[PDB]
Design a protein around this ligand. Sequence first.
Ligand SMILES: *[C@@H]1O[C@H](CO)[C@@H](O[C@@H]2O[C@H](CO)[C@@H](O)[C@H](O)[C@H]2NC(C)=O)[C@H](O)[C@H]1NC(C)=O
Ligand SMILES: CC(C)CCC[C@@H](C)[C@H]1CC[C@H]2[C@@H]3CC=C4C[C@@H](O)CC[C@]4(C)[C@H]3CC[C@]12C
Ligand SMILES: *[C@@H]1O[C@H](CO)[C@@H](O)[C@H](O)[C@H]1NC(C)=O
Ligand SMILES: [K+]
Ligand SMILES: [K+]
Ligand SMILES: [Mg+2]
Ligand SMILES: [Tl+]
Lengths: 992, 268, 39
Amino acid sequence: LDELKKEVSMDDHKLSLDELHNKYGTDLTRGLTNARAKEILARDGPNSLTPPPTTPEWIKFCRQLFGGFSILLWIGAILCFLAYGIQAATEDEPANDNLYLGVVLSTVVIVTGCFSYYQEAKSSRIMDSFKNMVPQQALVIRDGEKSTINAEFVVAGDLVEVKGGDRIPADLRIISAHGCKVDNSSLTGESEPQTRSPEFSSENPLETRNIAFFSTNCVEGTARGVVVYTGDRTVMGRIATLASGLEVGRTPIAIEIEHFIHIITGVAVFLGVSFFILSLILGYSWLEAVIFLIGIIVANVPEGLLATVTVCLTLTAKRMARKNCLVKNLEAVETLGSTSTICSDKTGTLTQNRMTVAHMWFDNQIHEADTTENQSGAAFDKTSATWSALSRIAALCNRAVFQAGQDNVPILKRSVAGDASESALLKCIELCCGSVQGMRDRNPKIVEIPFNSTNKYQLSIHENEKSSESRYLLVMKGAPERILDRCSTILLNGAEEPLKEDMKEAFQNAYLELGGLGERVLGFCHFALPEDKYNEGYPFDADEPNFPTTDLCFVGLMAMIDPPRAAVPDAVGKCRSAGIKVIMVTGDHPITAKAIAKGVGIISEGNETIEDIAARLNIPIGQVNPRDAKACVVHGSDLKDLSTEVLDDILHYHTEIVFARTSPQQKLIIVEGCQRQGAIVAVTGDGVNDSPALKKADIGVAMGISGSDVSKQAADMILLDDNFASIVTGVEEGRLIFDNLKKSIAYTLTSNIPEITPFLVFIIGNVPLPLGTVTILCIDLGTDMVPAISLAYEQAESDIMKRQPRNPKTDKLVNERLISMAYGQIGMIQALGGFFSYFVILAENGFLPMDLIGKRVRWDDRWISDVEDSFGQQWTYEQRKIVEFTCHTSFFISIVVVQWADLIICKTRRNSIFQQGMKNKILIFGLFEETALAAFLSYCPGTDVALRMYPLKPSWWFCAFPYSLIIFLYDEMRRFIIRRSPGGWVEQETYY
Amino acid sequence: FLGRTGSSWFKIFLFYLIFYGCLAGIFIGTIQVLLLTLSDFEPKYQDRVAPPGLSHAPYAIKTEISFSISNPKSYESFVKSMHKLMDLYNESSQAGNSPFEDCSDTPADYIKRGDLDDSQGQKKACRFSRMWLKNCGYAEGKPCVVAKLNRIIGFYPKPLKNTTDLPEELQANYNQYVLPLRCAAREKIGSIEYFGLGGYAGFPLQYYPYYGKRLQKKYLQPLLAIQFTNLTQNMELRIECKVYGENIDYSEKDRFRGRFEVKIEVKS
Amino acid sequence: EGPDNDERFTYDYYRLRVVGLIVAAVLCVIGIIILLAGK
Ligand SMILES: *[C@@H]1O[C@H](CO)[C@@H](O[C@@H]2O[C@H](CO)[C@@H](O)[C@H](O)[C@H]2NC(C)=O)[C@H](O)[C@H]1NC(C)=O
Ligand SMILES: CC(C)CCC[C@@H](C)[C@H]1CC[C@H]2[C@@H]3CC=C4C[C@@H](O)CC[C@]4(C)[C@H]3CC[C@]12C
Ligand SMILES: *[C@@H]1O[C@H](CO)[C@@H](O)[C@H](O)[C@H]1NC(C)=O
Ligand SMILES: [K+]
Ligand SMILES: [K+]
Ligand SMILES: [Mg+2]
Ligand SMILES: [Tl+]
């Protein structure tokens, strides 16, 4: 469906003005007829974007109500009402058991539904942001007259007019223009104004001057044009549809959840029906056969687990909110940890998005300035008298000014009225020479010649601030070579000197080096005009050369670039140390893209492209073995004629990849290419041209300050302070939460065994029921909750940023090793500790373990109010039941006591508690509150009716203590083996 | 295979065999020590049997014994359990001076055979003739229910003293040696008739305290036969038999705590 | 005692409940103290 939109567009900028009118039945001068425009409206439809059909929240909520655990809990809830119905008909049961348990279980499903619904959130308003880029109104020429109309009423063929400050209402063929410049950052991510004129200037319509696009704005001048595309058919309207239309897809974390749901659901249905038939064979009435099944359901399903996961995710997202990293989708909290490839935009993401002075060439020396936002570098020069001469030209031969009321904000961050290069120079001098306004007050400008297309230079004449002179100084800047052809002397370390071929060659060298760094280079020179030849009232003519512009003194060079953000180089290296592949994907030109790649460490030192090898060896590129080149730089124009299989080969064959001059669909294609190889991919960006890629990414991260509204709609995560170091933190947090989820899951599952085994022995042994159904829910929904959550606050056991990204095909959240430990080893020890306390309670009340076998028949018989114990005493029905429920209560408390040790062992997968310590305060809180809850549930009056919880005698609490301790020792010995031999036996069997 | 290789499948079996073996051996060990802390003659706790329960022979479907006089197999169900109990009180079961003793044919005081020790043989229990149960196949019309006080080791059932007012106000009040049992329903549409030891409507105190199964096997607890020769027919009659005493109490939950709940209906 | 051994069939479940609830409360307070050592 969207495969059409993933392709490069076709256009009609090649046609003549006249020819273009024939195609759209239009007038170049009079414009369309009121009737013809209305006709075309009904024909083509409105100049608007329609949002894609969404899935209502209704269906979204209910889709969770049927996912493995909820299905089993539904079967339980209904099976409760089943047994209740069968009762209400047969023998009038005045009880509330099956009825209430059926109500409780149905509530558990609904509430669990809210948790998973909260986790599976999708806040997407892509198409809405795009719609915000179409103006409310447009100016059209109809019947030879200009009028404002609803922009939706704009059709292909009419004559539109735009001017500085307004949004392009639709894709236009420029037919007339006067000084028109446009901001195409929507399509390129670059905000430098692009001229628009009627002349065709490139085969590529996205590069030609005679096309203006919807989603962009006119920055200055005026233009008229013929509408060629409207609504969904515009270049960026298609990007809108592509972006808004892209299928979301399941996250890595989501896939893991479903996976263990299958496992646990599997064992649940297995043991469920395996013992349902095992009971009927033993001659159990279907009346009972279902009651046992309900218990089996409740025992096997970890009722509180899915909600635990959600809370652990939420708590991890809260910590990241506190580092200026907003998470829109709870699952995106983990994806960053599983990320193996980052596709990053350059401008406004890796870079500050601001022309900044990078180097200066004066005194036959290359000086480097500090490009960082917060200025974390050092000085370059202050002493040289040459510097002050260059500094003066940079301030004086400059027409840029700071906007009013910025004195509060830092120099480099403040808004400037002017072109990017003049702003850069302004901020450079203001920083290291103080107020520039002061320099422009001490040296009043009397005449100037602003930068001309033809002159290729800008000159200014000022009254020298010096009192002993107060004469006229000439300054000029422009193209380095043009400035050179106008110089005779060079200000070396203070004093001038003739411009010999020697210094002239050093100039060329300096010029070539700076240009090689991808930096824009300017020349600077001045000339102190002779006093006798220029009186204090001498008039200077700016129109006609009234003053010399030759034999001037060359002062120096200055170079500039849109520099990396301070934290970016280091963040890139850190991603790469964690084994994450970092690719650059930018709408910017290749020379600039490549230079920043080396600056931030995308391309490491020494690595070459095929083009680099060819130039170094002075040989044809076809003569170069492409396998000798680990780095590559792909232009979008070449990308366009490559198949995906060939794109896949590029991705496979290079470690250091730069995709430059890419369109928005091309970014999507590169992302998909990476994913196709089985990689989890993150995208980082800030422009509307990142929207499709951000949507398709497993996780999209947008910049918060510099980011466009669209990009932040398309993302899963926002960096609110533009701190790229947050990606590094995000991946670290993502890995940590993945491990801690394992700990929390194992902990929760472990207590399933002591809830399952009592029901089994109840059938096979014919003893009184050791633990009840209600009692199970008091564990999974009550006591285990806070402890399970607390594992989310566990510190790393080792340097997680030192390991490679997990293999999502092999490294699962829940594997066989977890089940073996939780179900086969620790849970089994917990089961016994439960049974022990059960036998203790009964034996101390007169029913010794031996006489318990095959007694349930008489025990449950409501009409036998005289059962004989081991000592020959006789018990009524309600009397023995009180002891039985007291058994449920102590078995319950036994679970809590054995979960103490389990909580401590689940703390660490490898390390010892004596190494990791007990610095998790939430965990300790869990221990205290868990025990408080259990005690309250046993001793609070009335709980014997609502939950069948009975007061325990002090000695009862200590039954499971020896089992709780064996767990601690056992797991500590086991992990001691793991560490002592990384070999594999204990490791490959039990290492979560 | 599914998971691993044969070598791995073996090792995982050798482990869980030794592992579960140890766990079973430990579990058994903790059961040993538990038993080691307990007496053979007396349970550690008795507060959960404390107030004695009162149970009868007619096995009630739901605290009810409804049947038809004009039908044979209508009551043959209740006669099965009635027989089961009384069959134990046979004279052939009580033979010789061992381990039985002839005790007062009239309600007497308690009898202490020492302590709960094995320092003596089987503590000798008082004989009880089912022949003390006058009038009661059993009552084919108007049932002859048999009451019973639940056995509790070392329990001395103490009758109420005639200090103040009483339900069966002072009638045949053998204050010193009889634990009374008065059945009731207002709703007085019956005819209560009690049979027992010495002809009294109670339990003779000479059968106490019970020394337990280990120290007193073949021991016989006193019975109290109750006959309802009611002149009514074809209606559910809620009859409650209540025992009175210092150590006797009741509960709204446990409807068998020192009392009966019988729903007789001679639907004939 | 002899016939006056009523205490054998008695248990102070009332005190046990009072003590049990005291303990539960104090464990609840202690937990808050440790948690609130930083929030
Ligand atoms: C306990 O006493 C009952 C009294 O009914 C015995 O029942 C006797 O059963 C036999 C054989 O079935 C009959 O011939 C008699 O008529 C019954 N009564 C009597 C008085 O002998 C019963 O057998 C006795 N049980 C034991 C174990 O001795
Ligand atoms: C109540 C009692 C009788 C039930 C005992 C169940 C035992 C036999 C179960 C419980 C957990 C189980 C193990 C759980 C995990 C694994 C790892 C997997 O890669 C192979 C199977 C294996 C090794 C299972 C074998 C059987 C097992 C040990
Ligand atoms: C009980 O049986 C005796 C004979 O043993 C008889 O005289 C008497 O009438 C019976 N009593 C009743 C109330 O039927
Ligand atoms: K995404
Ligand atoms: K559980
Ligand atoms: Mg950008
Ligand atoms: Tl469970």
